[PDB]
Amino acid sequence: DAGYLTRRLVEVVQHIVVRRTDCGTIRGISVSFIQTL
């Protein structure tokens, strides 16, 4: 069950590559724990 999940997880994001320095977005996620920052 772990291998089948890993294959599907890799497949759904296999195309994601860091391609730009800054997309120039304005929005951000508000946070109000240390490891997630």
Partner: protein, 130 residues
């Protein structure tokens, strides 16, 4: 896709590379005159990106002429009417849309599409601009 790759280089680059009004016009024109496949969704998303850049980018006469041409070709007539109204206020106006009769004469197609759909009040207003 060739022109859109260059546009993405500019849109997600540094400040001195950011698209201007002319940059949007070239990429819009590339999709409007594509040889194959449906491109109306690509043009409409580019228009949304241009509108989100209003604080820095504003349209000119070519922007509305290309958008009237695109929406007329795909028979999105109500959107072609919105951009034709904005095209009226620019001097020269309908002549730019005419394109000297090239690219299947977008000026005539706009007039034909209004006639085919019984939008006569809009049709007369188009003739006034001409």
């Amino acid at each position: 896709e060739v022109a859109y790759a260059t546009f993405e280089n500019m849109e997600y680059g540094e400040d001195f590379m950011k698209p201007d009004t002319e940059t949007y016009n070239w990429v819009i024109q590339a999709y409007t005159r594509a040889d194959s496949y449906d491109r109306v969704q690509d043009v409409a998303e580019l228009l949304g990106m241009m509108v989100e850049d209003y604080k820095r980018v504003q349209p000119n006469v070519k922007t509305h002429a290309l958008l009237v041409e695109c929406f007329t070709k795909y028979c999105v007539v109500k959107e072609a009417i919105r951009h034709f109204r904005a095209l009226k206020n620019f001097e020269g106006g309908t002549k730019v849309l005419h394109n000297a009769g090239n690219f299947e004469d977008p000026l005539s197609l706009y007039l034909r599409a209004l006639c085919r759909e019984g939008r006569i009040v809009e049709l007369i207003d188009a003739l006034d601009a001409m």
